[PDB]
Design an enzyme around this catalytic site. Structure first.
Site, mmCIF file in Angstrom:
data_model
loop_
_atom_site.group_PDB
_atom_site.id
_atom_site.type_symbol
_atom_site.label_atom_id
_atom_site.label_comp_id
_atom_site.label_asym_id
_atom_site.label_seq_id
_atom_site.Cartn_x
_atom_site.Cartn_y
_atom_site.Cartn_z
ATOM 1 N N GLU A 35 59.477 98.393 64.898
ATOM 2 C CA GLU A 35 59.328 99.838 64.752
ATOM 3 C C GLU A 35 59.694 100.573 66.039
ATOM 4 O O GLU A 35 60.403 101.582 65.985
ATOM 5 C CB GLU A 35 57.899 100.205 64.332
ATOM 6 C CG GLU A 35 57.520 99.833 62.892
ATOM 7 C CD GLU A 35 58.164 100.706 61.823
ATOM 8 O OE1 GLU A 35 58.845 101.703 62.153
ATOM 9 O OE2 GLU A 35 57.988 100.393 60.630
ATOM 10 N N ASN A 46 62.612 111.870 60.651
ATOM 11 C CA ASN A 46 62.937 111.478 59.282
ATOM 12 C C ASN A 46 63.745 112.574 58.593
ATOM 13 O O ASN A 46 63.725 113.743 58.998
ATOM 14 C CB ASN A 46 61.670 111.200 58.465
ATOM 15 C CG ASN A 46 60.798 110.114 59.073
ATOM 16 O OD1 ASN A 46 61.290 109.078 59.533
ATOM 17 N ND2 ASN A 46 59.492 110.352 59.081
ATOM 18 N N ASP A 48 63.279 114.114 55.882
ATOM 19 C CA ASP A 48 62.485 115.151 55.233
ATOM 20 C C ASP A 48 61.850 116.133 56.227
ATOM 21 O O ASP A 48 61.082 117.009 55.814
ATOM 22 C CB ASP A 48 61.408 114.510 54.343
ATOM 23 C CG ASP A 48 60.267 113.878 55.142
ATOM 24 O OD1 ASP A 48 59.094 114.029 54.741
ATOM 25 O OD2 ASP A 48 60.532 113.241 56.180
ATOM 26 N N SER A 50 59.819 115.211 58.787
ATOM 27 C CA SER A 50 58.698 114.591 59.476
ATOM 28 C C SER A 50 59.199 113.690 60.609
ATOM 29 O O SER A 50 60.401 113.457 60.778
ATOM 30 C CB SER A 50 57.848 113.805 58.486
ATOM 31 O OG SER A 50 58.595 112.749 57.930
ATOM 32 N N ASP A 52 58.189 110.039 63.081
ATOM 33 C CA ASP A 52 57.366 108.861 63.346
ATOM 34 C C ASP A 52 57.097 108.745 64.845
ATOM 35 O O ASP A 52 57.998 108.938 65.665
ATOM 36 C CB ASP A 52 58.040 107.593 62.827
ATOM 37 C CG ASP A 52 58.695 107.798 61.473
ATOM 38 O OD1 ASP A 52 57.986 108.153 60.499
ATOM 39 O OD2 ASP A 52 59.933 107.627 61.393
ATOM 40 N N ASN A 59 53.768 108.240 60.830
ATOM 41 C CA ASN A 59 54.552 109.334 60.264
ATOM 42 C C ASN A 59 53.706 110.597 60.123
ATOM 43 O O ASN A 59 52.597 110.556 59.578
ATOM 44 C CB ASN A 59 55.103 108.906 58.896
ATOM 45 C CG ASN A 59 56.157 109.862 58.343
ATOM 46 O OD1 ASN A 59 56.280 111.005 58.783
ATOM 47 N ND2 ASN A 59 56.915 109.394 57.355
ATOM 48 N N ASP A 101 44.806 101.758 52.793
ATOM 49 C CA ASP A 101 44.878 102.722 51.703
ATOM 50 C C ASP A 101 45.543 102.161 50.448
ATOM 51 O O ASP A 101 45.892 102.934 49.549
ATOM 52 C CB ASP A 101 45.581 104.005 52.176
ATOM 53 C CG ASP A 101 47.094 103.894 52.182
ATOM 54 O OD1 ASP A 101 47.760 104.955 52.128
ATOM 55 O OD2 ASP A 101 47.624 102.758 52.230
HETATM 56 C C1 LIG Z 1 52.953 103.819 58.246
HETATM 57 C C2 LIG Z 1 54.105 104.712 58.616
HETATM 58 O O1 LIG Z 1 53.913 105.844 59.049
HETATM 59 N N1 LIG Z 1 55.332 104.161 58.438
HETATM 60 C C3 LIG Z 1 56.592 104.818 58.731
HETATM 61 C C4 LIG Z 1 57.269 105.384 57.462
HETATM 62 O O2 LIG Z 1 56.459 106.413 56.971
HETATM 63 C C5 LIG Z 1 58.710 105.891 57.691
HETATM 64 O O3 LIG Z 1 59.348 106.089 56.452
HETATM 65 C C6 LIG Z 1 59.519 104.986 58.636
HETATM 66 C C7 LIG Z 1 60.796 105.659 59.144
HETATM 67 O O4 LIG Z 1 61.725 104.711 59.615
HETATM 68 O O5 LIG Z 1 58.776 104.415 59.732
HETATM 69 C C8 LIG Z 1 57.507 103.878 59.516
HETATM 70 O O6 LIG Z 1 57.569 102.656 58.792
#
Ligand SMILES: CC(=O)N[C@@H]1[C@@H](O)[C@H](O)[C@@H](CO)O[C@@H]1O
Ligand SMILES: [Cl-]
Ligand SMILES: [Cl-]
Ligand SMILES: [Cl-]
Ligand SMILES: [Cl-]
Ligand code: NA
Length: 129
Positions: A35, A46, A48, A50, A52, A59, A101
């Site tokens: 990650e 992202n 949309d 948002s 990360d 996210n 969750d």
């Molecule tokens: C648990 C969490 O927030 N995971 C995020 C996911 O929401 C997102 O689509 C992605 C983008 O590359 O990265 C992470 O996996």
């Protein structure tokens, strides 16, 4: 802060992530590797709108507030900037809510595509724990 592999494994274990919800410590280190490349300051936008944040790329659509994700939730009740500190407590505590969750670690796209089903133990091999 860019963690070393065994340094991050030790901090995750100290904060109670080893076998949290049945995910051994190698899963958490592996997910952080792919990650964020172990970098607490990682961010990624992202499509949309948002973002990360942090070593586990949490996210803003659901889990933290960054003031620029219209219609989003802040389920971990933290500013997203708290997920970028060199202290991973906020990231770990939020990860515990996310992984609880109902979908487990599949919430992390990198874990599902690059860690799930592999020899995740390799990521903590050699670390004194
Ligand atoms: C648990 C969490 O927030 N995971 C995020 C996911 O929401 C997102 O689509 C992605 C983008 O590359 O990265 C992470 O996996
Ligand atoms: Cl493991
Ligand atoms: Cl917002
Ligand atoms: Cl820490
Ligand atoms: Cl699970
Ligand atoms: Na949010």
């Amino acid at each position: 802060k860019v963690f070393g592999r065994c340094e991050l494994a030790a901090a995750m274990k100290r904060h109670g992530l080893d076998n949290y919800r049945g995910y051994s410590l190698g899963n958490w280190v592996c997910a952080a590797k792919f990650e964020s490349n172990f970098n607490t300051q990682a961010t990624n936008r992202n499509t949309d709108g948002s973002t990360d944040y942090g070593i586990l790329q949490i996210n803003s659509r659901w889990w933290c507030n960054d003031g620029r994700t219209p219609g989003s939730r802040n389920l971990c009740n933290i500013p997203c900037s708290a997920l970028l500190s060199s202290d991973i407590t906020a990231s770990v505590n939020c990860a515990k809510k996310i992984v609880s969750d109902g979908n487990g670690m599949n919430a992390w796209v990198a874990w599902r595509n690059r860690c799930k089903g592999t020899d995740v133990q390799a990521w903590i091999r050699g670390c004194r724990l």
